[PDB]
Design a protein around this ligand. Sequence first.
Ligand SMILES: [K+]
Ligand SMILES: [K+]
Ligand SMILES: [K+]
Ligand SMILES: [Mg+2]
Ligand SMILES: [Mg+2]
Ligand SMILES: [Mg+2]
Ligand SMILES: [Mg+2]
Ligand SMILES: [Mg+2]
Ligand SMILES: [Mg+2]
Ligand SMILES: [Mg+2]
Ligand SMILES: [Mg+2]
Ligand SMILES: [Mg+2]
Lengths: 101, 208, 61, 178, 139, 271, 137
Amino acid sequence: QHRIRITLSSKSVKNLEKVCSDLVRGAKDKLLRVKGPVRMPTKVLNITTRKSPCGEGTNTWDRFEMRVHKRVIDLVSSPDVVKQITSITIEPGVEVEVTIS
Amino acid sequence: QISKKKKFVSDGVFYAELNEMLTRELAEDGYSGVEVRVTPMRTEIIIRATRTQNVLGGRRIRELTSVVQKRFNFPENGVELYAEKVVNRGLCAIAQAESLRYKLLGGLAVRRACYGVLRFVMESGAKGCEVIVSGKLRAQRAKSMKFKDGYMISSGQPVNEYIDAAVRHVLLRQGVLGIKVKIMLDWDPKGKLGPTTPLPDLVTIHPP
Amino acid sequence: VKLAVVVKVMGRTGSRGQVTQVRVKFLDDQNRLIMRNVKGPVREGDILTLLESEREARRLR
Amino acid sequence: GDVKLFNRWTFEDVQVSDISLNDYLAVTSMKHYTFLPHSAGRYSAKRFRKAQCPIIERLTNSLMMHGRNNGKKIMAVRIIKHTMEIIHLLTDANPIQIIVDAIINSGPREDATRRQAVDISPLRRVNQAIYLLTTGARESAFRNVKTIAECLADELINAANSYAIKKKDEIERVAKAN
Amino acid sequence: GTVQCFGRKKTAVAVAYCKPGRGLIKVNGAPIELIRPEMLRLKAFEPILLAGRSRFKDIDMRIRVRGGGKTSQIYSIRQAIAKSLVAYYQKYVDEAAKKEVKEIFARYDRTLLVADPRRCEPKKFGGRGARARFQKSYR
Amino acid sequence: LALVGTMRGHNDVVTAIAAPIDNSPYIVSGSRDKSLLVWRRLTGHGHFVQDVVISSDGQFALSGSWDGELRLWDLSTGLTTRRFVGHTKDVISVAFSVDNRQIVSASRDNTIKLWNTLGECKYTIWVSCVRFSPPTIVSGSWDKTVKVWNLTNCKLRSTLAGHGGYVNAVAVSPDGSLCASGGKDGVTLLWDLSEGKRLYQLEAGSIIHALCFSPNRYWLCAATEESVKIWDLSKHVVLKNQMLYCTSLSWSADGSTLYTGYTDGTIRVFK
Amino acid sequence: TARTVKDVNPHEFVKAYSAHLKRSGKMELPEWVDIVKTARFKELPPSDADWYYIRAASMARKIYLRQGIGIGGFQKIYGGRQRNGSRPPHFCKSSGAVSRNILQELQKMGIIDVDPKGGRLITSQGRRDLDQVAGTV
RNA sequence: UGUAUUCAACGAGUAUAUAGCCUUGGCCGACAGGCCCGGGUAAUCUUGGAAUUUCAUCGUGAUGGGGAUAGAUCAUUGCAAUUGGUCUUCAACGAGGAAUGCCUAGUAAGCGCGAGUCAUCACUCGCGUUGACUACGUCCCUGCCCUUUGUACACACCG
RNA sequence: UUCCGUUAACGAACGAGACCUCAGCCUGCUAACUAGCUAUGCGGAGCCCUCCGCAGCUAGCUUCUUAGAGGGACUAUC
Ligand SMILES: [K+]
Ligand SMILES: [K+]
Ligand SMILES: [K+]
Ligand SMILES: [Mg+2]
Ligand SMILES: [Mg+2]
Ligand SMILES: [Mg+2]
Ligand SMILES: [Mg+2]
Ligand SMILES: [Mg+2]
Ligand SMILES: [Mg+2]
Ligand SMILES: [Mg+2]
Ligand SMILES: [Mg+2]
Ligand SMILES: [Mg+2]
């Protein structure tokens, strides 16, 4: 009852993958159906900037590029058990959001 | 509410601001980075220092904890800030960077100061070290002078995790001297010393 | 108009290396072997036409 | 056979009256003859690879000039179809035969470089012939009442008295004087 | 017999869904005979005009094409129909017929069974095109 | 022994040739070509299949791929009846049970695994090719030794250490009363299953891929690299790209023919 | 047994359906048929005196093919090349009031209707007419 | 030039104050522009995402190629005039001397899209589409590297 | 200055290579209601068949798009 959606946002693939597997297996511990994990399309932030502080010299541009990875999990369960499952420890770089679904 | 992209940029620039603020206040103690985590209802921001008994003074740590709470409009009783001791002072690049800065500012000859720092980093157990000092030492003309030894890689992906580098601009009496310190870390599978992965050129063999 | 088959290629020669010197034999008389030069791309086993069959050449021109 | 150019032209009638330019032209009615000269194949990879390419492909690819015409192979093959219909309807013969006759009568034999005169590669011979024909058609089509197909057809039949034959004449005259 | 075959060229994918019947051929819900431009139409009748309608006289074809350009979509369907007709016999009829049609298609053209991998490479900075640079004026 | 014919329908190495017990003409060849064949084609795996077998009823085909999994296949429909996943290292060999209800698999993980064809109970105990006794199970090891297990409690029965080279496969009698090995030493060791002691030796010369016991002739055919050698159980051989090696031998149910899995697909039948 | 919008090519379909609207004689015309240009990037207004009926047939086919498109969508699909002189060319839209007007007339013919999803949908009678006129090809 | 087929990727997009961003849809307006219903703090909504291609008027004419330049006029942005709509005006220009730059495969070349710039106004960074000729050789020129050699150079032959 | 060798040199540090990102192949796996494919049911037009749209809290699946672990190429065979 009262399906719950959890969103996992990060920049590192390894941390997100390990915590997603951990959370899904923890949900499976309570014998709970889980639809997922759903690998949200990664979003890329691209920025280009000129290295030279003054425009002198041949124009060379560096291209910084950041990746944002996301996973989403839907659990058909009461929210309290979802909070119990996610109450366990976390690793750096991963943000957890919970919503009513 | 605030979108994910703007929030991520805000935390990135906020961490940079925190680093800049803390590195310009703990010159007497050797600020050596910060770790920030977001637990449910808590935002932990632990400062690192080579000398920790002087950071505590623990009232001053509580003032610096309120610093981020009230300057950045953070909620009360949701932000924590403590101090921590370096695992290895020598293996930390910035630690020896401002150590050399302090040594040259005190009155020691720069050459002897870099020899001392160079001996200290091998005391820590570095694979190799390099210290570069650029600017005017005694004469009007500026010069670049280097002391390097040990393993010193210079290119490729392994350069950004198998080395630790630090650069500083020490304001001397006659100008500004640029100092750079680079330390190679060995392969520690646990990861406490340096990287947790071996080098591409480093291959181990099990005897038959 | 003495058609010749390229028999061996002696490496690119000339100022720019544009000309390629080859040895050929006539299809009318197989046993006669001459040396000539050819522009463009030439590979062995090809058949090449000409106009004057009396011009000679030199090795590594 | 079961393969015909635009389902209209039969390849099993066209031969080459020379034993030096056979393999460089894909006109044999056993393979290398296609439905239309448009194919997304790679032919610049290795040396002598374009010899396997159909002749009609070479003719239609050499027309995408000048810089306002490249990337428009569709117009190229449409124009080649139009000129092909013109040639077949006028001459009452296989247009492939007219194309082959024009190419085999528009290839220079000798040049002069370094100044010493010496022969021409057969692949370079057919390439030069096709380039000369396309440039002559372009010259006859610029600032004129004629469309592309008409001048292409006229230059194709006249080369089987023409721009390409006179260019070959002057090139061979320059060659034979040294 | 219902199979999925994807024909990819550049950035155009033609998904063909098979079903037994009377050999109806449709692209994007529109007849194969209405391929536009009509002059490149023979490019997409290659498998029908080479293998023959007797091969596909009892199974229909329905294809949906997405992405790429017009020519890329034409090549995508050109290879997708070929893949689907190989899958016609590979999974539902026998081995010898599928083998022989694959060999005949390969001997006609390699692209009919092999997807050409040429893709557009990224453009480099400091120049106009991907590989071309600006005009260098020394003085 | 004479040539019957030649086959050229394969583009890589065929590693296993399996024939139904019922002598029905529905044999299955499992190859490292990423493809199987039926004399129907199978491609459900995504790696190089190594060992294939045929169920007792003869209407199913079990094949295991080097990706580290196994699949039992509906031969008629060419679809997987069931999968078997959990061999982290690449599988090396498969076999059925005495009742053809349990499947024994040997992989690169230094371990052997028994799986239920339908049940969810699976148990575990470089192990080379295995062949169950028609009820112990024999297996090749990575130390020139051949192990024999106990099916009562999945316990080790005995070990046979007399081989000078590695053991690439195992051979069992059609009545489950013999054991045979082979390898780089070129000397095939024959032992008795009951006492688990060294009976005798046969001399071949090099690696033997498959050691097949004649169901009726009571013979032993070995695919030696130098020349395929056949012994009668008088210990005397009473069979012939610059590199020429076979990959498998298969004794027909009739006994008057034999089928070989070669490298470049030239499957050869002898009679 | 039946030829449908898919089975008959768009060019001859739109010309035949424009003729269908020509002899239908039910829908109205504005006072600005010749004067107004269908797009601002266009220089010469459509030289065809009956351009309005061809355009209306284009709408009649478009709403059959896809539904849910608003005035802005039709303004977009009828855009094209705008050459700004010595400046590089770019993209431009088409006229909006004329498209709004012709869509309103098509509602008055009952060929389409408004939707809760935004845009317009084809009504059963209009697509029936398109179906039988395709069958008459 | 005018009709009518229609096939992409990259990225970006709100403070809700009525509402600062992306804008869907309806209405009004020839177009430029305005009002209402609203969605999206985002794989949800924008996002349903051109050259090319049948058909015709031109017809070889500095001509409907070209639109420099001008005048009249409306409105948007901005606190305050930049741009964009309509018509009229219709300059040089008919492949360009010495010299000169880029490029070998989905590349060159051709066509657009997004972002940065931004209260308003597009060169640079990427994205995709159509898509070839030749070459696959060489040190002839322009350089670079190495070996031998000569030197009265060493600020090093601009000696 | 990549290697084999020659060797009054031997043994080593950088650079290169190695490394990392993206694309190129996978009818193999992981699994998708903020993504899709097919059948059916309903409604739309000319029972069936051509055909457009809507549901079926599982009709089934991930072949098609997404993103992850993996594999694939190493010059091995001629
Ligand atoms: K338009
Ligand atoms: K003008
Ligand atoms: K229905
Ligand atoms: Mg290195
Ligand atoms: Mg490198
Ligand atoms: Mg036009
Ligand atoms: Mg498209
Ligand atoms: Mg003009
Ligand atoms: Mg003009
Ligand atoms: Mg600028
Ligand atoms: Mg898939
Ligand atoms: Mg690989």
